[PDB]
C-alpha cells in the first residue's frame, strides 16, 4: 500500500532502541548485584 510512513530515521531509531535495552539491562544487573552483596554474598 506504500503507507508505512511516519517513522523516524533508522539511525536514530536503532540508537534509541539499543540505548533503552542497555539501560534496562545495566540497571537490572546493578540492582541484582547490590542485592546479592546486601544479603552477605560475594
From Swiss-Prot:
Cytosolic enzyme that catalyzes the carboxylation of acetyl-CoA to malonyl-CoA, the first and rate-limiting step of de novo fatty acid biosynthesis. This is a 2 steps reaction starting with the ATP-dependent carboxylation of the biotin carried by the biotin carboxyl carrier (BCC) domain followed by the transfer of the carboxyl group from carboxylated biotin to acetyl-CoA. This is Acetyl-CoA carboxylase 1. Monomer, homodimer, and homotetramer. Can form filamentous polymers. Interacts in its inactive phosphorylated form with the BRCT domains of BRCA1 which prevents ACACA dephosphorylation and inhibits lipid synthesis. Interacts with MID1IP1; interaction with MID1IP1 promotes oligomerization and increases its activity. The biotin cofactor is covalently attached to the central biotinyl-binding domain and is required for the catalytic activity. Expressed in brain, placenta, skeletal muscle, renal, pancreatic and adipose tissues; expressed at low level in pulmonary tissue; not detected in the liver. It is linked to Acetyl-CoA carboxylase-alpha deficiency: An autosomal recessive inborn error of de novo fatty acid synthesis associated with severe brain damage, persistent myopathy and poor growth. Consists of an N-terminal biotin carboxylation/carboxylase (BC) domain that catalyzes the ATP-dependent transient carboxylation of the biotin covalently attached to the central biotinyl-binding/biotin carboxyl carrier (BCC) domain. The C-terminal carboxyl transferase (CT) domain catalyzes the transfer of the carboxyl group from carboxylated biotin to acetyl-CoA to produce malonyl-CoA. It is found in: Cytoplasm, Cytosol.
Amino acid at each position: 500500500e506504500k503507507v508505512q510512513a511516519e517513522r523516524p530515521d533508522t539511525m536514530l531509531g536503532v540508537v534509541c532502541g539499543a540505548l533503552h535495552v542497555a539501560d534496562v539491562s545495566l540497571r537490572n544487573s546493578v540492582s541484582n548485584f547490590l542485592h546479592s552483596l546486601e544479603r552477605g554474598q560475594v
